[PDB]
Design a protein around this nucleic acid. Structure first.
Ligand SMILES: Nc1ncnc2c1ncn2[C@@H]1O[C@H](COP(=O)(O)OP(=O)(O)OP(=O)(O)O)[C@@H](O)[C@H]1O
Ligand SMILES: [Mg+2]
Ligand SMILES: [Mg+2]
Lengths: 33, 105, 83, 117, 395, 55, 148
RNA sequence: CCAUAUAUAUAAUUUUAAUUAUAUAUAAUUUUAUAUUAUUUAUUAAUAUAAAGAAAGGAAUUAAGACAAAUCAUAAUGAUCCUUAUAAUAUGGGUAAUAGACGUGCUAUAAUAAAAUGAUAAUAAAAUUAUAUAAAAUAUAUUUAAUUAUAUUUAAUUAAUAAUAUAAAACAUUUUAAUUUUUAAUAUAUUUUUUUAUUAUAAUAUGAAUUAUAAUCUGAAAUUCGAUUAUAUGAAAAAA
């Protein structure tokens, strides 16, 4: 088995979060506001 | 002043001994997204470090406690042989051998 | 032979250990706090105590929730659990 | 055949338990450093100091060489005896005729004993 | 014998059987006659040094009839030249553990008795920080006073110093104190000292009640500071315990550990070192001794400028106030260099003459080899560990 | 310690802003660990092998 | 290699000398007997401190005094199950040290070093009850000699 | 084949532990020269002395009998038995109940022994981190700090690189009931962290089970039945 680390010198120049928002919008949580 | 601000805001990401600022990004699915993320964070850090208009981080001493701990978790070989203890007089002295002299001249 | 609230201590006994040892509600921290309040130095001993200081210690201890009162509290709590 | 380096130093490596020691022995006046520290600071136990001394005093050259020892691994006694064995191996270079003498003192033989399961 | 080992040797009078031996007497102006040679303190010096507590336990002083010292060119001569030449005579003695810092302090005291100076020595300042002596709060002196420690210390000052010197210096102003001495306690409530009619020697002999004793100590220190007749050498041994114990073991009414400077002994010591209390003779000096029995902070190294200041070092390991105080006075460090091989030769010679060397050391060993052996075992010159190699190394 | 707390707090807030880090000086339990916790679903479900095998 | 002048002189001078001993066998054996739980340094400290008191109260070499004491106290032979059997140096030293340690433990000091040092001081001055134990063992050996 | 000692190769000595790492190779079952005692008498053993030696340990590897096995959970096949039940799913409980009895370990019963402290950080090895680890910092217990436990926040590392993690005993100082062997007031001293003199001065400051209060960690869930912290408790345990 192999691993290749590449060094590139260069110039200077949310699934759970999505679900939480949906539940908060749902009528089982929004009904408690 | 801008460099000192950069180092202060780097916090644990800056190493004063080696003077290296290192950032690691693996949050996004691909490596290219993480590269863009790191580059953008570097531009933000640089832009607001170069900004000195309403910025007063000169009187904040640089914190190195993280570097102190990291170095404390490693062995050190700082010592070296004393300079005055050296005696070159007793060093081996190369000895003449005519065979190679004639082979080469 | 130093007597405080009907409890006897030997003269050489250190106050902040003896009060914790021979009283129900006082531990190490409580004994240290009492001693600091009364101005006794950390390693003061019973035979050095003057009678006014003994009475002051007795008053301070009496203002605490200790001995029979604390024992009754614990027993009442155990009885309530049993009930 | 071992010989001194450009600075006149004899370099030796010894081992004991999990400890390893690398010693530079030069001609001098009996000064010793361990990990850049004084011998008495690094080695608090007198027995370990005497163990380090023993090969020097077998050839009665104590006070004639300066020792720069560098240890790592194991504990105090292991490091001290590794210094001892390394010092013996380094001393053999300066005068090979004394090797047998050192070999008869028991300081030129590795203590192969180690913790076993 | 009932006490433990260290207190056994210290207090068992085991020097009673020591060899009756004579050595050259120590005097700095005659250092050339005594340079690099083991000496014994003068008879007058022993009486003053013993009261000062210069000779302490664990120093292997029981082997010999009386404690002795080696007048070293690099330790005694070098320091004592500075103590008699430098404009600012504030010094801190440092080095590795057991290198001989106390001995040089004892030698420094011995010079003080020779030059008629008055010595104020605080040995083991932990006595007023451990908490095993009583304390009380004073309000006229907005400070915490410890009568038990003071009463002893006042007596140590008197006996450690010649009455003739204490007789000379005369009181600047009236002092009145509560009186506890038994003939005149009930007869007259107070004792009234007078300007230029009573002297400080009377002050040392005033007996006050425990709470008034706080006034007695500050009166003495201020008096010795104002006068210019006699030099005063304030000396502290085991100083690091003061530096690295910023807060004492005493707690106020609110169970808040009392700060060192809040206590009278703490502020008096730091006032002299910092320089707020100015001794007026001009030859007065402050000598402080580090020790290896105390923990190591970044306080002292920063105070001496050895390392740079790192503000993010916790207060346990760095006390800025002490650094400011020690830097306020121009304190300098004299590091006791370790014994060279030649000095080791001089000491072992005296040990041989005292019959403290073991049989194996003296019989059958080429003398030069022994010096090389014990120079190695000492750690290339540590006096304590050289001495342990001879007397406490049975293997 | 000697350096004031206000300066360090400003430094911490601003640095957290730069590196897309959330700043919570109050110490209140927001529960961000749950949002930042890695998912172990696929590996746990792959315990017995991929279910599509030639039979 | 031809040894140079200094090397050969060193070889001659050294071969004219014996090897130093690594350790004093008797003192090491006594120390190991004091040792428990592998704490060698504690045993060495205790032994050296006791010997230091012995010197300070006698002002003679305490290592020599210890060996005089062990040699004199320890029994040469002992009866075993009943026939006498000879004892070599280590067994004699062990018996003598145990006798010493009992009388030391009978003393008052909280520190074992002080008790041991004062007991050794008393022994070096010819004052010890273990002489009676040695005498009884020797008497039993004399009584049971016939069964060699 | 390990381990050990060496030689060659490899590493641009910043993945640094070159004192290291792993490939190949060599080495030993040690070889010798004498002395003495035995000897099947030397071309032999016991030792001992001298010389060259780094050289001193270890595992595995085969069959034949005989016994024991169903947590034979070390399996297969067969025999027989259930097939609305002896198969299958869910909720809760139990496997932790105590008169007792015996094994196995941990903690103790004090001074050749326990406790506190010891930042330019005394000294290791072998491991582990993509179903993670969690650094430093801030805050609360809590108190100038330190320590210890949680909380907030994720720095690097998916690794000879960073973390788990400053190894601990060791060593130094101090304290430690029984112990009137101690502390305290006066004096005292060439023992001053100390000496002297006169008065005063059977379970502890060992042990931490058990019990109570209030908090905390995991998890959806800690009642039966988990772990952790602090504040109170403080049992048995001494001799043979
Ligand atoms: N010049 C000297 N002459 C004789 N003995 C000496 C000399 N210097 C040191 N010693 C002895 O060496 C030991 C050193 O003790 P000392 O108290 O002086 O050391 P230290 O470095 O101050 O120690 P610590 O850090 O413990 O206070 C004592 O035995 C002392 O007697
Ligand atoms: Mg000292
Ligand atoms: Mg307890």
């Amino acid at each position: 088995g192999m691993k290749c680390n590449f060094f590139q010198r260069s110039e200077i120049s949310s699934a759970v979060g999505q679900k939480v928002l949906e539940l908060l919008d749902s009528p089982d949580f929004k009904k408690h506001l | 002043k801008s460099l000192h601000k950069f180092r202060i805001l780097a916090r644990s990401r800056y190493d004063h001994t080696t003077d290296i600022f290192k950032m690691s990004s693996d949050k996004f699915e691909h490596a290219s997204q993480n590269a863009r993320y790191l580059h953008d964070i570097l531009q933000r850090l640089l832009a607001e470090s170069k900004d000195l208009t309403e910025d007063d981080f000169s009187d904040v001493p640089l914190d190195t406690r993280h570097t102190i701990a990291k170095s404390l978790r490693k062995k050190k070989r700082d010592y070296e042989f004393p300079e005055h203890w050296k005696r070159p007089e007793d060093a081996p002295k190369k000895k003449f051998d005519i065979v190679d002299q004639l082979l080469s001249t | 032979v130093v007597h405080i609230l009907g409890k006897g201590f030997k003269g050489k006994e250190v106050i902040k250990i003896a009060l914790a040892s021979k009283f129900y509600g006082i531990g190490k921290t409580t004994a240290e706090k009492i001693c600091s309040k009364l101005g006794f130095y950390p390693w003061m001993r019973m035979h050095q105590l003057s009678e006014p200081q003994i009475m002051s210690i007795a008053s301070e201890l009496s203002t605490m929730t200790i001995e029979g009162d604390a024992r009754a509290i614990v027993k009442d709590n155990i009885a309530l659990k049993r009930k | 055949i071992k010989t001194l380096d450009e600075f006149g130093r004899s370099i030796a490596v010894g081992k004991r338990k999990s400890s390893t020691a690398k010693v530079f022995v030069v001609r001098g006046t009996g000064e010793i450093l361990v990990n850049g520290r004084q011998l008495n600071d690094y080695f608090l136990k007198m027995k370990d100091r005497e163990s380090i001394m023993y090969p020097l005093q077998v050839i009665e050259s104590v006070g004639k060489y300066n020792i720069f020892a560098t240890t790592s691994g194991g504990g105090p006694t292991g490091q001290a005896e590794s210094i001892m064995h390394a010092i013996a191996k380094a001393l053999v270079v300066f005068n090979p005729l004394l090797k047998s003498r050192l070999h008869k003192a028991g300081v030129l033989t590795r203590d192969y004993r180690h913790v076993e399961r | 014998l009932y006490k433990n080992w260290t207190n056994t040797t210290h207090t068992a009078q085991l020097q009673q059987t020591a060899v009756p031996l004579a050595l050259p007497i120590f005097n700095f102006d005659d250092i050339s006659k005594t340079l690099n040679k083991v000496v014994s303190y003068s008879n007058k010096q022993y009486k003053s040094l013993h009261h000062l507590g210069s000779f302490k336990k664990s120093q292997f002083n029981e082997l010999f009839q009386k404690p002795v010292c080696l007048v070293r060119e690099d330790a005694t001569n070098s320091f004592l030249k500075k103590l008699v030449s430098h404009p600012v005579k504030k010094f801190i003695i440092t080095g590795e553990p057991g290198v001989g810092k106390t001995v040089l302090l004892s030698q420094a005291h011995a010079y003080a008795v020779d030059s008629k100076q008055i010595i104020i020595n605080i040995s083991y300042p932990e006595l007023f920080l451990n908490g095993r002596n009583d304390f009380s709060y004073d309000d006229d002196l907005k400070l915490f006073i410890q009568p038990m420690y003071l009463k002893k210390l006042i007596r140590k000052i008197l006996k450690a110093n010649d009455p003739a010197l204490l007789k000379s210096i005369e009181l600047s102003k009236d002092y009145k104190f509560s009186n506890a001495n038994p003939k005149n306690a009930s007869v007259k409530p107070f004792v009234t000292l007078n300007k230029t009619k009573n002297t400080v020697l009377d002050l040392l002999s005033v007996m006050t009640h425990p709470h008034n004793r706080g006034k007695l100590m500050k009166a003495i220190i201020d008096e010795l500071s104002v006068q210019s007749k006699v030099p005063i050498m304030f000396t502290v041994d085991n100083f690091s315990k003061v530096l690295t114990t910023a807060y004492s073991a005493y707690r106020n009414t609110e169970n808040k550990q009392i700060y060192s400077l809040d206590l009278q002994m703490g502020k008096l010591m730091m006032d002299i070192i910092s320089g707020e209390t100015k001794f007026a003779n001009g030859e007065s000096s402050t000598i402080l001794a580090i020790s290896g029995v105390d923990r190591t902070n970044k306080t002292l190294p920063v105070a001496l400028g050895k390392i740079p200041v790192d503000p993010y070092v916790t207060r346990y390991h760095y006390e800025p106030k002490f650094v400011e105080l020690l830097q306020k006075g121009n304190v300098t460090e004299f590091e006791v260099p370790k014994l060279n091989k030649q000095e080791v030769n001089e000491l072992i010679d005296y040990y041989k003459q005292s019959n403290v060397l073991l049989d194996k050391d003296i019989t059958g060993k080429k003398w030069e080899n022994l010096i090389d052996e014990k120079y190695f075992l000492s750690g290339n010159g540590n006096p304590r560990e050289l001495l342990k190699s001879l007397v406490l190394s049975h293997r | 310690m000697n350096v004031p707390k206000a300066r360090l707090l400003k430094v911490a807030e601003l640095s957290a802003k730069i590196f897309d880090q959330n700043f919570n000086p109050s110490g209140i339990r927001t529960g961000s660990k749950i949002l930042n916790e890695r998912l172990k679903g696929p590996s746990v479900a792959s315990y017995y092998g991929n279910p599509d095998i030639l039979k | 290699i031809k040894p140079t002048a200094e090397q050969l002189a060193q070889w001659e001078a050294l071969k004219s000398v014996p090897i130093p001993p690594r350790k004093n066998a008797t003192l090491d054996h006594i120390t190991n007997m004091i040792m428990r739980h592998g704490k060698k340094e504690k045993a060495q400290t205790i032994l050296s401190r006791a010997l230091y008191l012995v010197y300070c109260q006698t002002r003679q070499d305490p290592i020599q005094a210890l060996e005089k004491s062990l040699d004199e106290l320890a029994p040469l032979m002992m009866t075993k199950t009943v026939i006498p059997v000879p004892l070599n140096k280590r067994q004699r030293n062990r018996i003598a040290w145990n006798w010493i340690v009992q009388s030391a433990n009978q003393r008052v000091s909280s520190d074992f070093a002080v008790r041991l040092g004062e007991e050794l001081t008393a022994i070096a001055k010819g004052t010890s009850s273990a002489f009676e134990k040695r005498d009884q063992i020797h008497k039993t050996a004399i009584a049971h000699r016939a069964y060699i």
